[model samples]
Target chain A: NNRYSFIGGRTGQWQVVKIRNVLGPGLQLVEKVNILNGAVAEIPLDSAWRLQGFASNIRYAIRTELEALQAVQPMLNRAEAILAVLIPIKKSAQWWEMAQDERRDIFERESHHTAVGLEYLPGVAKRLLHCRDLGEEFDFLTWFEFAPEHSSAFNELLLRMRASKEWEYVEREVEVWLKRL
Target chain B: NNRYSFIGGRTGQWQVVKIRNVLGPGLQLVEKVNILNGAVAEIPLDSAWRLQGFASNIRYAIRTELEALQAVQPMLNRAEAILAVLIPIKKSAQWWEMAQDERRDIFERESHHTAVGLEYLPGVAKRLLHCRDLGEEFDFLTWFEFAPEHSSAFNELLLRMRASKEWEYVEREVEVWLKRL
Candidate 1:
């Protein structure tokens, strides 16, 4: 019953990781999720909420893609590069808004082959579509969905890195960034 | 007839020096006036306004005392030690609340006596009484009147000794103190 749909359910693991890495590590992912959810929750159910929910679902899918990368850090470098290409397109005007010629140009630029109608989008879009199907948009999706879901993974990582003195280095880097900013 | 009684007056040379060794050479004693008139300005004043003015005067006096110590490195050391003693007493019970027996016991305890009463008592009591008379009783004579002030002074001394490098040491030391507290 879905009117707008991806042909092959937007499958591509590389695009997911790239989106997450481009957004930066833990906190930025959480921020993106929160912003998307908050924006969507503010609108009426049938109007902008639908569009906002769609946008928010894109964010959620992106977060899920990034979470996978966190699980597989080895793929992070490649994932980041791919996400660098796809994210801007996902955030641009809706696919229908583009002129046919412009759509053809983007398709040629982003597509691996003309045979597949859609390029592999990040899991964010998939998650957004899932939420749209359910007609449920939550506030604080990152804290509720991602943080709680991945809490154990994060805690384990934190324990492993506790004695590495990375916090001191990170704190110093933050201070440097803040001062420069 | 003057309603205000003058107690015994002691004459001593009031010296001012910028503690060149502690704060470096930027600060200096610009004026050393004879406090011939009461430190209180001799003007008809409203009670509340006069009380506020008295408080401001005590603040300046305390600052002057600190600045005076800053003028000479040797004086800074002595002042630090004195402040180290005075801070605790000020933080403790008010002078009137402490039992006469308790006060006498503290007076008699030789080590405590020398540090708490004989060495630190005269200056702290004089300044405090001066402030109380003027209806000002907060800050240096209150909660933060003790070890922290000496700690701050010692930090300044460390900074002067090591210049910029002292900040690292000071930062670590402050962290330790904060953690302990």
Candidate 2:
């Protein structure tokens, strides 16, 4: 029951933190990006855009690994948190065609994707949304919220993770930073 | 008078060389990409897309270095050349805002961008196209022609260049490979 819509246009609850084209094609330069908690009906006729994604069970995490992440993960919308980011990513076709457990091994065992994110602790809260089967441009819509002081830590975490073998499958990605209004 | 247009659609002289999204937004998955020289007005109305660029004097090379490169460079239409690649790239705003000489230092001195490319010399014939001021999605459209045997070498050359400090300024890039028909 957790579907989210990220709408970008002239209006929103969050203002642009600084949109960056990290890799691949980027979103249109929008002044605001609003995150709605439920399914959206109709968007603006023109001059605006929206992307939809759904929260799903952690596909790659094992029991202990999942527990480890939850223990250190902070809740979204923390009082002190002021910055948020949206990174839309699409993996190469080869990645999707691979077996499920193989994908898990890349991100967990070989890549240590979870361990890297865990290093940032409760300082950086995150959520993952899947859109691959939905025929959207990006397969995953990742959301992160962090305090101002943790900015560098968050960046370091990204740097470490992107360096992993798993990121090799990341064919397209665009980072959009936003601030609470 | 040297203007080149990379037209991608159902018709073109070159066949799909296997387009892989290296980074950023990619082009539409087209069956062919035709490189046309000289100016032409009016393209196929809707299904086709095109990007234009111009060849200019080497902006970053010194006289001696230029001579060094030209001495070992191969011509574009060498008989052995069967694989061609189009890499469209856009640098971060900070890179363009920097002073000319400062930019040169980062690419040449600090990053050794040219040195890295020269290592793959005559095996990889190359050309540069500038489109930064053309209001296009990308700034530079780089073209490379190489024999099938040098395929791995070309990839290795790219890996080395992407690993350099200068690549940090590269905000967007998409690699498109095509085969001579």
Candidate 3:
């Protein structure tokens, strides 16, 4: 049964900490849901929902290997280390006012997002979060990962993208570093 | 059982529509995440990233204000519009170099986050998504709801926060609007 979500499999040693202000501000500590370990991390969906602000945010992780990156070869065979960078993007309503065809033209011709990302190839891996539809903070929560040696490649890839047409739409892009701890 | 997700079930006839990869920039569409619902859309939580960007994002969402608004009687009572704003704060490492106490002093004293929020209470109801530790794109994703008549108030409350001392620590904040189709 899809009753349980075994994301990243039992090997996923990941944990999630959710901090909120239930009564007021001052970093009101709510509760932390430990989703590490295997099914051990799994909980009844209803139970998770019972917790205060749980929204439609409860969706299965549906990340697939970006098909475009399939052609690129990896700098290294396997990643000995992993790092994550988070980017939340938004566009000015002004931009959305344009027709879809015009917008597409700008995306491909002006932004060159696909082309620039293709340039980085298999070295850097990315996961795009569909947050806006979920009523989350940002529109997209793009998380990228790479090995230590491929760090520069990751940096260049992001830098170029930021300079592209998309950056013009990017309202907030904050990068943080994290490895298995 | 990777089945369909069940979102909210209020008197809200709000039917959300989703569109992807149309424009040049991003935040192309705004969505109200159906997190809090009796239908309760559920999903899996794999990892929550750790955050370094600390801002005076704190503003009055306090029960004090909530209660005050509760008594004032809303412009529409229920929601006619929805919004999701994601903020990712990754303070420059240089900030952490200061003493812990020093950082605290700046946060509580210099950044009047709570004070500014209290100023425009009873207009907006918000839900903050703590994404920092999740390795997601942003540190926080704030959800909002209110009637169309009170829209200006919501925007003002936000402008004040973004312009406050807390915004100094804000790295990226993107806002978008959403509602039923």
Candidate 4:
């Protein structure tokens, strides 16, 4: 049962068809999950249940709330598909050797993490998937979503971040570009 | 290990300098590819390769850790065809759930992959890229390529694969046309 689900309370208008890849061709008709209107989808956990980070953290304080949000919102309507990019970064052991507050100073003030991101306002949205504490494959998973047209702007955001002082400690990384079919 | 040699994770320039993120800036150097082919390259011992499901097939006696990717230099230098095809497999669990011997019976026994390819070989060259073990959503990447003339045969072989029981497990297949140009 390699799967997991998430439940959103009394959702607005959304129809989700759980697609099963049957055989050749494409997604085979498995079974239609006729979800009810007022029902919340209970997320089942497969291996993904062990996923480390969620709304469970209290960070992202450096940037002003309004500016950060506008960056994500501006691109949603134009995006025909959710063009998600998964960038996995594994920092070197030396990174962990440093004190946490020292790490914070490099991250918050020196890196200008939030400000650089704000530069791409509204063209793309972003999130950080922390896998560091969990001893998973990659330490950090940087996820982003944008429209095809705005892909160029997204690239700019990536370049500035990667060139920052913080990336020097990143010894491992991978870039995955994905979209829903 | 520099660009001329080999080291995975990511590719770029400088002793410690890195590639400019293509997301933001334009591609600077790294002209080794006109199109990205089957990633049967230098994913060094630096990160996870075989520990993941990659390098699974015991091929070429397994290069030693000290090995230089330049060992295969001539192959790339004189290679006639570049690689393409993102053969995505779905329903792997179901296919996997089947007994191992039976799985063998289907995969190598009656699946017709060997027989099918024996007919098209030399003209068609390829490699298999395992992604699941790499913590990716896709299970396998069936990469292949041939000179321009093999295009018709390539399409034919793909459809045949699309119909096989082997394909019964495949859900999505995208032939991302990349070249050595």
What lDDT does each candidate get?
A: 0.24, 0.81, 0.43, 0.46
Q: Score the docking of each candidate (DockQ).
A: 0.00, 0.01, 0.02, 0.01
In model 4 chain A, the worst 10-residue window by lDDT is A26-35
Ignoring the other chain, what TM-score does chain B have in each prediction? 0.26, 0.96, 0.54, 0.57
Which residue segments of model 2 deviate by more than 4 Å?
A1-181, B46-48
lDDT of 1 by residue, A31-71 (tens): 01112223222322222112222221111112333455345
How many Å off is the CA of B46 in candidate 2? 4.5
Q: On residues B1-181, what C-alpha lDDT tens digit does candidate 3 reach at each position?
A: 1111222222223433432322122333422333322212233232112122122121223344335445653342254544332333444334434443344445546776555554555566544444443333454555566666767887688677766665676555544344644
**Pairs of residues clashing in candidate 2:** A23-B24, A24-B23, A24-B24, A24-B25, A25-B24, A25-B25
> How would you encode candidate 3's per-residue C-alpha lDDT over A6-84 as one tens digit per residue?
1221122322222222111212222222222212434444333211111212121111223344457354324454554
Report backbone clashes per prediction.
12, 6, 26, 10
lDDT of 4 by residue, B66-106 (tens): 03222321222225564443343434566544443355456
For A72-110, candidate 4 gives per-residue lDDT tens digits of 555432436356554556787776655434565676679
Candidate 2 second chain TM: 0.96
DockQ of 1: 0.00
Judging by lDDT against the true structure, name the best candidate: 2
lDDT of 2 by residue, A86-118 (tens): 999989988765654466668778999878788
TM-score of chain A of each: 0.20, 0.95, 0.59, 0.62
Candidate 2 DockQ, CA atoms: 0.01
DockQ of 3: 0.02
Off by over 4 Å in 1: A1-181, B1-15, B19-30, B37-39, B42-91, B94-96, B110-133, B138-181
